Amino acid sequence: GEYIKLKVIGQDSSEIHFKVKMTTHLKKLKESYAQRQGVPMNSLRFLFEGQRIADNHTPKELGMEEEDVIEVYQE
């Protein structure tokens, strides 16, 4: 299918957008985000509508759509 574009918002209000397929495991997004922030992945928690995103959550499981937001907080 098509990529959807998600906005990942940091604690400092910075944004990195990610294109993922509906079947992508979101661990891949978490890894890339942590890499680009220069911090360990396990130091961060990733929330969708306030709910914790699991490594093996997919956008399809979470009901995500184009331009949905992920928030990142410290673990």
Partner: peptide, 15 residues
């Protein structure tokens, strides 16, 4: 800040 969009995408082995 500029926009940032990241795309999340054996027999040859020698080790």
């Amino acid at each position: 800040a500029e926009e940032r969009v990241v795309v999340i995408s054996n027999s040859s082995s020698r080790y």
